[PDB]
Design a protein around this nucleic acid. Structure first.
Ligand SMILES: [Mg+2]
Ligand SMILES: [Mg+2]
Ligand SMILES: [Mg+2]
Ligand SMILES: [Mg+2]
Ligand SMILES: [Mg+2]
Ligand SMILES: [Mg+2]
Ligand SMILES: [Mg+2]
Ligand SMILES: [Mg+2]
Ligand SMILES: [Mg+2]
Ligand SMILES: [Mg+2]
Lengths: 170, 293, 159, 205
RNA sequence: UUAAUG
RNA sequence: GUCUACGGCCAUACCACCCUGAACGCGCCCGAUCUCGUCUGAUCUCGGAAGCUAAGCAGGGUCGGGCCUGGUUAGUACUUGGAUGGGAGACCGCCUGGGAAUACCGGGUGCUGUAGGCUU
RNA sequence: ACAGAAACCUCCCGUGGAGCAGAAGGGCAAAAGCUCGCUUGAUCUUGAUUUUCAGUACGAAUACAGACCGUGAAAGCGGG
RNA sequence: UCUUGGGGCCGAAACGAUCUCAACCUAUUCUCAAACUUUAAAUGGGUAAGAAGCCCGGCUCGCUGGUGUGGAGCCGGGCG
RNA sequence: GCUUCCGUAGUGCAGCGGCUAGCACGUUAGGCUCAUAAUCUAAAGGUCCUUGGUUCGAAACCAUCCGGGGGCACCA
RNA sequence: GCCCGGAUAGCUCAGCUGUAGAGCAUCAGACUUAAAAUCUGAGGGUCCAGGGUUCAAGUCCCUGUUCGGGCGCCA
């Protein structure tokens, strides 16, 4: 008999687009994330100057947005419809989370805009459990325990039971 | 392979913090500024009014520091409100106001200041402070202790603060963190503060759910339906609660029955039991190896 | 020559002990300081304001002035010809009570109790501290076994 | 070449090692501190002999090198190439200085780093040879020939320990039989009763 | 104006 | 027996894993209308009470690591004062007191102050 | 996904192994570090004390006091 | 052990297998530090060993103050 | 030993932390020529002596290392 | 400290409050078989920085930052 407080849910879906160039490309990738979600994303800037790729310190490189709830469930349903409900062994992390990246956002269902263009985006699913709000809150901080963690085997069987997704080694 | 961070050298160099810091309860940087007294005051007790908003309760206490432990001179809990006529709604802003008022009136009853320093009875929500009356014993003063609650505008800690001020505790405070203070145009609205104190936000959300759908209404408010709480009854119920609190502020403790004296806890294992356990485990491993081989 | 700085050669002295860093304990703050209490001085490196000097680290004086977050203390400094009872202003962190006064006060209270007692009786009980005397003659009872004969061990090289 | 050892024979100064402050030190001649058959077990070399000093002096790294070669040659001539194990238990860290006179003189006299030397106490092991039980007088002869490379005076003492261990030879076989010691190459592993019981079960399983 | 050699 | 709120000394209290939690509580949890703040009600704030001890938390266990406290090391290393003591020196021995610290081997694994509960 | 030893995001461990302008030492984790919001206590005036010391200055600092102020909800903190 | 790799070997190749050799990880082991340290002496440096001290009763305060609260200063006695 | 300076393609030089390191010659390739040269058009080529540090960034700024070159070495 | 000159396109210099000019340099077309020699157009101006007067300032006015040229020297 499985305890209903151990229902493995999804905490968040992390979207990011890393174009590597500030300005027009970056703001059109922000428009891509805004048309995907329905909310404004936040630009992520650099940590230090790398002269190999053409970036400088405190220069806006990427853009990202975290999505919660049924909207994150629906965008992840779109993403698995794109990637035909299959993932690899190495895509799964040992901490219990996973993620993957699509080639371009036109597969999600978004109509092409000739002003905006083509931008790919990267999914990262942070899985969840009722009782993960202890470590990040202010009142009573603490670790969540060994039984309460999500393992890689438990993530694989959750994915296979939920989305009927085949998992192939590689 | 990679190096293990938490090694024996790590546990030898590891200094633990304080117990309340490890529990995550006391902000010692705030307590350093709050609780200490100036040395030229010479054992003058420095009173703080501690507010802790729990999930189902609102604790309002008053403490002064002693070196063995800070003694609670007066305490007030939110579950004492069904004795005053608040059956349900124990963790909202109105219950915080009633708990602060109850703490204030109980402290003045224990100090013997029931008639003097009445406070606000016809409460509107304006900027009010307790002025000292000449030829009388002086007004009680204390300083607020919110703790780890983020003090934004519209906080139940400041609701308990307003309850203590209206009950007659001379606490210095600004009308900035009270609900009603606009952040943009920067003026204080006392009518919005009166609505939040008397609880018309809960009544407006009750009417909004009743207009929207009965299923979400019964999902949100269940014991309000169980104890027949209507929005027209709300303001009169809190007025009768304030009247009962200002009428009978004294607390009677519960009578203690003779304890049955049984141990629900599991007791601690002794040295002879541990030495017997390890010997039985070694003997079981040896006889299992003899049985296998 | 040496430098004449405030904290010259104070590497180990103002340093906190091992696994005793971090937040200052608060009973040290809230412990009250009356005038005329014998007070020893021990520096602390956490709070840098109100530190005493390295010549006053370890010294013991008494309080003459009390302020909001510090007290003044008259300590005895030996400077090159004489001892001067000079006054310094020290913050709360660098200050403890000396129990040399407390043991004397307990002994005074015990002597006052023993002086009020046995006055109507007439017994003369000694109140002064008498030092460790030559001990009284006693009987060593070597019952049963004889004393063990100690033999000096022969030499053998361990290394 | 360099000065005689009569100058820096005795411990005169504080211990002055190579560090962040003392830089520009030339490399010492002794770098290989053990030889013979060091890829070996504790059971196949029972006998152990030590060269124990009897003076509080400073032994130079070049003297350590010369005594190491002098012990090595006699151990190869006697016990073969794989029948002994020599170990120099004095690593030289004390950086010793030189005041070269080309005329300034004694003004500003602080030495540039000349070389390395080892601080040696009274009753401290200089060299240690572990070998079979048959090769006893050969190890005594090798340490006697190695004494001439050092100044002062030191003694040759055949230890009661089992090789390069801290346990006695009469108790070593009983401890290995009762599985309190594990052969772990040159050294030995001592298992107490303080650890968890899974280690005990892994030993007795 | 430059333009040497086999 | 035990919890909550505020604490004192800040590991005998910490860390890794496992087992049990009756009642109050503490929490996990349900939503964003109002106060409030974020890309996101995840944090904070607000309004609650369908489910739950899964987790935090409380107690206990690990021939557990760490920590605290003793023995051993050891009257050892060291050291106040002394000698027309030794030795070419290096250093060592003695008289007089004082006296350690590793490795190794035992024991323990939070007490307590104020207010308020629960086991009626 | 491009993405690689290194561009961006997330999770876990992480007693400080980072940072606090500099030389080194001490100190610091819901801070003394990083980012925000507001400010100019880096303002005026007496006295006392420490350090160097002869117990003389200068420089630096330490507690207070009288005023005007900044911030914070407040305790308080701040006169570089 | 694949956490990676230099030379091969049976491999088109494959963390499939294989002897390894290198850095890494885990238990050890030898020798040290004036500008290292968990510990830690001997010697030493402060303070106290009373009349300028206790136990009483009462006034004053513009300081601090739920509270003839706290602190300080004055008095009048008793204790040798 | 003391004080000082330099060390950049193959060679001789420049270079004001943010370059594609610059000029000449050498080199190679192609024209011109009967060939060669010269001439014309192209191109390749820097471990920026070595280590570290400051810096968002170091060919340079700071420190040491290994090379090199001058000036001093004195009255008695 | 005083007085007077300049600082304007990559470089040297003019510019009388109402597309900033002359020469060298670069690129692009002629010429020559081709460079160079010589013509032709085009590009390139933080007018040292800020403030003030005026409708409008590179210009007029002080304030400062570099660079000469001469004077003057009680902490
Ligand atoms: Mg705070
Ligand atoms: Mg019953
Ligand atoms: Mg010397
Ligand atoms: Mg929520
Ligand atoms: Mg639980
Ligand atoms: Mg459980
Ligand atoms: Mg243990
Ligand atoms: Mg802060
Ligand atoms: Mg600062
Ligand atoms: Mg002031």
């Amino acid at each position: 008999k499985e305890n209903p407080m151990r229902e493995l849910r999804i905490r968040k879906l992390c979207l990011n687009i890393c174009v590597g160039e500030s300005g027009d490309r970056l703001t059109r990738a922000a428009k891509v994330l805004e048309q995907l979600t329905g909310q404004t994303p936040v630009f992520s800037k650099a940590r230090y100057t790398v002269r190999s790729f053409g970036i400088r310190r405190n220069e806006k490189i990427a853009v990202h947005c975290t999505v919660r709830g049924a909207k994150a469930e629906e965008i992840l349903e779109k993403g698995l419809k794109v990637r035909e409900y299959e993932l690899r062994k190495n895509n799964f992390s040992d901490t219990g989370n996973f993620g993957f990246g699509i080639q371009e956002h036109i597969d999600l269902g978004i109509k092409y805009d000739p002003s905006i263009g083509i931008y790919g985006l990267d999914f990262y699913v942070v899985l969840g459990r009722p009782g993960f709000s202890i470590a990040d809150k202010k009142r009573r901080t603490g670790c969540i325990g060994a039984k309460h963690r999500i393992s890689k085997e438990e993530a694989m069987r959750w994915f296979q039971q939920k989305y009927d997704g085949i998992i192939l080694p590689g | 392979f990679v190096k293990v961070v938490k090694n024996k050298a790590y546990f030898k160099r590891y200094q633990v913090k304080f117990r309340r810091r490890r529990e995550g309860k006391t902000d010692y940087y705030a307590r350093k500024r709050l609780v200490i007294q100036d040395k030229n005051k010479y054992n003058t007790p420095k009173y703080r009014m501690i507010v802790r908003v729990t999930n189902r309760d609102i604790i309002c206490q008053i403490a002064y520091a002693r070196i063995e432990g800070d003694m609670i001179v007066c305490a007030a809990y939110a579950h004492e409100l069904p004795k005053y006529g608040v059956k349900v709604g124990l963790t909202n802003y109105a219950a915080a106001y009633c708990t602060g008022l109850l703490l204030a009136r109980r402290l003045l009853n224990r100090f013997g200041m029931d008639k003097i320093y009445e406070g606000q009875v016809e409460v509107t929500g304006d900027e009010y402070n307790v002025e000292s009356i000449d030829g009388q014993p002086g007004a009680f003063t204390c300083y607020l202790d919110a703790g780890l609650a983020r003090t934004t505008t519209g906080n139940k800690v400041f609701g308990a603060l307003k309850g203590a001020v209206d009950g007659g505790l001379s606490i210095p405070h600004s009308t900035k963190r009270f609900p009603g203070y606009d952040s943009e145009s920067k003026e204080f609205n006392a009518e919005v503060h009166r609505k939040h104190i008397m609880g018309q936000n809960v009544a407006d959300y009750m009417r909004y759910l009743m207009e929207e759908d009965e299923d979400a209404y019964k999902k949100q408010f269940s014991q309000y339906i169980k104890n027949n709480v209507t929005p027209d009854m709300m303001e009169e119920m809190y007025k009768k609660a304030h009247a009962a609190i200002r009428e009978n502020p004294v607390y009677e403790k519960k009578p203690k029955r003779e304890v049955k004296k049984k141990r629900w806890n599991r007791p601690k294992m002794s040295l002879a039991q541990k030495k017997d356990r390890v010997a039985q485990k070694k003997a079981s491993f040896l006889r299992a190896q003899e049985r296998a081989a | 020559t040496n430098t004449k700085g405030k904290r010259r050669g104070t590497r180990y002295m103002f340093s906190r002990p091992f696994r005793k860093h971090g937040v200052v304990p608060l009973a040290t703050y809230m412990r009250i300081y009356k005038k005329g209490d014998i007070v020893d001085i021990k520096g602390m490196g956490t709070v840098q304001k109100g530190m005493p000097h390295k010549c006053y680290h370890g010294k013991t004086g008494r309080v003459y002035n009390v302020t909001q977050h510090a007290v003044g203390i008259v300590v005895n400094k030996q400077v090159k010809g004489k001892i001067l009872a000079k006054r310094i202003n020290v913050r709360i962190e660098h200050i403890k009570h000396s129990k040399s006064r407390d043991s004397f006060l307990k002994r005074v209270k015990e002597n006052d109790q023993k002086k009020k007692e046995a006055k109507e009786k007439g017994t003369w009980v000694q109140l002064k501290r008498q030092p460790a005397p030559p001990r009284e003659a006693h009987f060593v009872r070597t019952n049963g076994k004889e004393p063990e004969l100690l033999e000096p061990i022969p030499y053998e090289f361990m290394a | 070449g360099r000065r005689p050892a009569r100058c820096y024979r005795y411990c005169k100064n504080k211990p002055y090692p190579k560090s962040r402050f003392c830089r520009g030190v030339p490399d010492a001649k002794i770098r290989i501190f053990d030889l013979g058959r060091k890829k070996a077990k504790v059971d196949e070399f029972p006998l152990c002999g030590h060269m124990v000093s009897d003076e509080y002096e400073q032994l130079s790294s070049e003297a350590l090198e010369a005594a190491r070669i002098c012990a090595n040659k006699y151990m190869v001539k006697s016990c073969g190439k794989d029948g002994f194990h020599i170990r120099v238990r004095l690593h030289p860290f004390h950086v010793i200085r030189i005041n070269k006179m080309l005329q300034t003189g004694m003004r500003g006299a602080f030495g540039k780093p000349q070389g390395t030397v080892a601080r040696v106490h009274i009753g401290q092991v200089i060299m240690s040879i572990r070998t079979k039980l048959q090769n006893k007088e050969h190890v005594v002869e090798a340490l006697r020939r190695a004494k001439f490379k050092f100044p002062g005076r030191q003694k040759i003492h055949i230890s009661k320990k089992w090789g390069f261990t801290k346990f006695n030879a009469d108790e070593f076989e009983d401890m290995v039989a009762e599985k309190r010691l594990i052969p772990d190459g040159c050294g030995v592993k001592y298992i107490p009763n303080r650890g968890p019981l899974d280690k005990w079960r892994a030993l007795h399983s």
